C-alpha cells in the first residue's frame, strides 16, 4: 500500500479497484464502497488512519468492521487496501510486555517493533502433528495439580462464577513458571501469554504490576481487549494471543496462554455480526458460536518430536451464571476443551477454595498429565470425592447404618483443610508430594482438623529446615521412594503428637 508525492496522498483513491469511499457508517461496520479487489478479510485503512477488516464482501459494498470507536470514520472516508488477512505481531520480543490486542504495546515502555508477524486465521494442525500430552505443566496450586493435573499442549477450561478465583488460579499457574525461566532444563520451562477480554484496564494493571512484583512479567506477554475497545478488539484478541504462543508451539519452546473471558468475548461477538445484519440465532450468538470457540482452542495442541516437541496449553476462562455450567457458550466451550476446572462461588467463603466441583469437572486427558508422583498419590484423591458427594451429603443424617463406614467420610473432612489451596505462592511439585501425599497415606487423619493448615504451612518450613533431601529424591528417581516414604512417615507421625499431649 502506497501513495504519491503531490500532497497528503496525491494519487491512490482515484480507483475504486484498490480503494473505496465510505457509503454508510455507524456502530463500527463501515459499509465501504469501491474496494473491488478487497479480499474476504484483508484488514483495510480509513482516512482517519484507522484499521478495520473487510468481513462481508458483497455485490455493491464490503461491510467492514471498524477497529475502535466511530467519531472520525464518516460517510465518504477514503478506504485503502492492506492486502493481508487478519495478521498481528509476534516473536520473542513481545516477552516481558503488555500490548492492546492487535499487536502494539500499551505500557509506555516504548516500541516492540517486531520483524516476524503471525496471521490469526491459521488452521489447527491435526491428528498427525499432535502426539500425546506428556510432560505436564505445574500450576503450583496444590488442589489443582495433584487433583486436576494439567498436561502440556492441551485446553483446560477453568469455569467459575463472578468472584470465584478464575484469575488468581491463572495468576498462580503462570507465576509458578518463575524458577524454570532461568533454571537449567530449557525444556522444563514455560512462556506465558495472558490475554484479557472485557476487563477494566485497571484490573489488567493490577495484574501487570502484580506479576511484575514477582518478576513474572519478565517471562510473560500480556495483551488487552479492555471495555473501551470496540467489540471487534474484544473479538480479535484471543485469536491474537493464540498466534503469540504459536511461535513457541512451532519453535520447540512452549507456552501457557490464558484466554481471559471467552464468555466476555461471547457477549462481545454477537455484536459485530448483528450490526453486519447476519441473522441471529440463539441468544443473539451468530450461529457460528461454535466455530468461534472451537476454531480457537483447536490451536493449542501438543507437538510431536517429528513436528517440534513444542506445545501450547490454553485454559479458557468462563463466567458461571449462578452455577449453571451448561449454558449456551459454556456447552459450546465444554464440548471441546479437554478438562474443565469448575470454580464455585457457592463454596468459596466456606473456606472451600479453589472450590472445584468433582463430578461436574474432569482432567479428561487421563492420568497422562499427573506424573508418577500424582499417579502414586492423587490417583485416589479426586474420585474419592466423586461418589463421596453422596456420603458427604448423607452423613449429616446417618444413624443405625454401617458403623465403620465413618472411615470413608473421615478421609474427607481432614483432607479438606489440605486440599484448599489459597495464597499468592505456588508449591513446587516435590512439595505437593510432601504434604498431600501424607494424607492419602492415612497418617494425619484421626487428629482433630483445623490445625491441618498449620501443617501444610509449617511442614514446608520444617522441610527446608531439616528435610531438603526428600524432595531431591523426586529430582533423582521421580516418585515417592520406599526410603523417603519411611522418612516422611517418621515426620508426619511426629506431627500427630505435635499438638497432641
Amino acid at each position: 500500500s502506497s501513495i504519491l508525492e503531490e500532497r497528503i496522498g496525491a494519487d491512490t483513491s482515484v480507483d475504486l479497484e484498490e480503494t473505496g469511499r465510505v457509503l454508510s457508517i455507524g456502530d463500527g461496520i463501515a459499509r465501504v464502497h469501491g474496494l473491488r479487489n478487497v479480499q474476504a478479510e484483508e484488514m483495510v485503512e480509513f482516512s482517519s488512519g484507522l484499521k478495520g477488516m473487510s468481513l462481508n464482501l458483497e455485490p455493491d459494498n464490503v461491510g467492514v468492521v471498524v477497529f475502535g470507536n466511530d467519531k472520525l470514520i464518516k460517510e465518504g472516508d477514503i478506504v485503502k487496501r492492506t492486502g493481508a488477512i487478519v495478521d498481528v505481531p509476534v516473536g520473542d520480543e513481545l516477552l516481558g510486555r503488555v500490548v492492546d490486542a492487535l499487536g502494539n504495546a500499551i505500557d509506555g515502555k516504548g516500541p516492540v517493533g517486531s520483524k516476524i508477524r503471525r496471521r490469526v486465521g491459521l488452521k489447527a494442525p491435526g491428528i498427525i502433528p499432535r502426539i500425546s500430552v506428556r510432560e505436564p505443566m505445574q500450576t503450583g496450586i496444590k488442589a489443582v495439580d495433584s487433583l486436576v493435573p494439567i498436561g502440556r499442549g492441551q485446553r483446560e477450561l477453568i469455569i467459575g462464577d463472578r468472584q470465584t478465583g478464575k484469575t488468581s488460579i491463572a495468576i498462580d499457574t503462570i507465576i509458578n513458571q518463575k524458577r524454570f525461566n532461568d533454571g537449567t532444563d530449557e525444556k522444563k520451562k514455560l512462556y506465558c501469554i495472558y490475554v484479557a477480554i472485557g476487563q477494566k484496564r485497571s484490573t489488567v494493571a493490577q495484574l501487570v504490576k502484580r506479576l511484575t512484583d514477582a518478576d513474572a512479567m519478565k517471562y510473560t506477554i500480556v495483551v488487552s481487549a479492555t471495555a473501551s475497545d470496540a467489540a471487534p478488539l474484544q473479538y480479535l484478541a484471543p485469536y491474537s494471543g493464540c498466534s503469540m504462543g504459536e511461535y513457541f508451539r512451532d519453535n520447540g519452546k512452549h507456552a501457557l496462554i490464558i484466554y481471559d473471558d471467552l464468555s466476555k468475548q461471547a457477549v462481545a461477538y454477537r455484536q459485530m455480526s448483528l450490526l453486519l445484519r447476519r441473522p441471529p440465532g440463539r441468544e443473539a450468538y451468530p450461529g457460528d458460536v461454535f466455530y468461534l470457540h472451537s476454531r480457537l482452542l483447536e490451536r493449542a495442541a501438543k507437538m510431536n518430536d517429528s513436528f517440534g516437541g513444542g506445545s501450547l496449553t490454553a485454559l479458557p476462562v468462563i463466567e458461571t451464571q449462578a452455577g449453571d455450567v451448561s449454558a449456551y457458550i459454556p456447552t459450546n466451550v465444554i464440548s471441546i476443551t479437554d478438562g474443565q476446572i469448575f470454580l464455585e462461588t457457592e463454596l468459596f467463603y466456606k473456606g472451600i477454595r479453589p472450590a472445584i466441583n468433582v463430578g461436574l469437572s474432569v482432567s479428561r486427558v487421563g492420568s497422562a498429565a499427573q506424573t508418577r508422583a500424582m499417579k502414586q498419590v492423587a490417583g485416589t484423591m479426586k474420585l474419592e470425592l466423586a461418589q463421596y458427594r453422596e456420603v458427604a451429603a448423607f452423613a449429616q443424617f446417618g444413624s443405625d447404618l454401617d458403623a465403620a463406614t465413618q472411615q470413608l467420610l473421615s478421609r474427607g473432612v481432614r483432607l479438606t483443610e489440605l486440599l484448599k489451596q489459597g495464597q499468592y505462592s505456588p508449591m513446587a511439585i516435590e512439595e505437593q508430594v510432601a504434604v498431600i501425599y501424607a494424607g492419602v497415606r492415612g497418617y494425619l487423619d484421626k487428629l482433630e482438623p483445623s490445625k491441618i493448615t498449620k501443617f501444610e504451612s509449617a511442614f514446608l518450613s520444617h522441610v527446608v529446615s531439616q528435610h531438603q533431601s526428600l524432595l531431591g529424591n523426586i529430582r533423582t528417581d521421580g516418585k515417592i521412594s520406599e526410603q523417603s516414604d519411611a522418612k516422611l512417615k517418621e515426620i508426619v507421625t511426629n506431627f500427630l503428637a505435635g499438638f497432641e499431649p
Binding site: 455507524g26 466511530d70 468472584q163 489488567v204 466476555k264 467463603y349 449429616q396
Partner: protein
Amino acid sequence: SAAPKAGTATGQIVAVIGAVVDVQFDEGLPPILNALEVQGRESRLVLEVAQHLGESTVRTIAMDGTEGLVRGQKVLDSGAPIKIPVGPETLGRIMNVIGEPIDERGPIKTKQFAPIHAEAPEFIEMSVEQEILVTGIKVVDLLAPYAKGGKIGLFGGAGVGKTVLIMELINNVAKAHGGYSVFAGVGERTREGNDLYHEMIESGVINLKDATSKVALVYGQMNEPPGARARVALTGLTVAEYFRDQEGQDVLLFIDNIFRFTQAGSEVSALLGRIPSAVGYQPTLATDMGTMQERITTTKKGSITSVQAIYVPADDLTDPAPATTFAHLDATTVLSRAIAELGIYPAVDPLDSTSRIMDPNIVGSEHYDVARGVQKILQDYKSLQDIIAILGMDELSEEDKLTVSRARKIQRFLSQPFQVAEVFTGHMGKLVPLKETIKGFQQILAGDYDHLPEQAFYMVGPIEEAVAKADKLAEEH
C-alpha cells in the same frame, strides 16, 4: 473550537419518528457523536448525530422532546459533542443533560466546557494503589469493603436499596470527605432529585449564598426521552472528571442508576436500524456499560471515589443488565426482595456481594476469616434452613442448630437500619467505623456470648445491646 467548512453545516430534517430524527446535510456532513442544534425551535433541541446513513444524511438521537418537529426544519451543526460547562463555577448548581441550568439560578458563567465524549484513561494512566476508605456500615463496609477510586454498585429490583444506600453512603460519606462530590441522577425519580436538593440546602452541602458548595448536580431523568437519560450519567461523569484531571482532586460521584445508560439503548437501538439481542437489548450493551464506566476511574493526576447503582429488571439477576455490570463494581451488594420480607436491611445478601479489596492485607486476617466463616456457616445454613431439617429448626445436629443461633444472629448484626430509614420508625441509625466490631461479632461464631433468645437480637447489631435488650424484652422465673 467548533467551526465547520466553507459550506452549509445546516441540515433539513427529513424524518422524525419518536426519539430519532434523521437529518440531511448537503455541504457539511456532521460526524458521529456531534451535538446538533434544531432551528425553528421555541427552546433548546440538540440532536446528537449517531450514524452516517449515506445519501448525505446523518441520524441523530434527540436530547429532549421531539414534539412539533417538522420535516424540513433546519438543524444546526455545532462541531463537537454535547459539551457541558465543567469547572468550579458549576458546583452547588444543578445542570440538565446539555449544560442548561436547571436549578433556575441563571447562567453558569464558566471559563470553558468539556465535551461529554472523551477518550478514557489509557492503560499507563491507571494506578494500582488501592487505599482503603471506611463507610461505617456492617456488610457494606466490613463484609464487601470499598476503597479509594473504587466502584460501588448495589443490586436490587424496585425499592430494596440503591437510592436509599446512595443517600446512606452520602451520610457516612458525602457530608465529610475532602475534595468535592457529584450526583448524576439517571432515569430515577424527580421527587428524590428535588428533596435531595433541598436536603443539600438544609445541611449546608449546597449553599446558595456564600460559595461553600462541594457537590455538583447533573440530572437527566424519567419525564425525558432516552437520548437524555443516556447522556445524563455521562455529564455527571464529564463533571467528576474535570475535578480530578485539570483540578487534581479526589472527587466522588453518585449515579442514581448507571445502567439507565442502557435502558436508553433498549429504547433507541432497534429504532436506529439495529438487530435486537438478549431480551431485545442491543448489539452494544457490552461496549456501552464498558466505554462509559471506563471513565470513572483514578489516574496519575487524581482519583474518583465513584458510587453507582444498577437496577434488576424483572427481579432477574439473569438479565444481562445487572450482570454485565458486575465486572465493573469494586464491591457488590445484590439486595434480595426475598430478603426484604425478612426485614433484613440493607438487603445485602450473604453470597452475591463480592469485592476486589478483601484480602487480609487491607481488610484483615481475623475479619476476613470471620467473614469467610460467616458465609461458610451461612452456606450450609442456606441448605439446613430447608434441606435435612425441613423448615422447622430444632430436629437434631446442634452443629447446625448452632448455625440457627450464630448465622441467624449474624444476619441481624449485619441488618444495620441506619439514618436514611428514619422515615419508617425513627430507629437507632446504627453505624460506627469498626471501633468495637472486635470481640462482639467474633464471639458469635465461636460460641462466645451467642445464646440470647433469638429475635431478642434482631433490630440492632452491636452485641453489647443483646444484654442491653435482654432488659427490654426478658424471660425467666
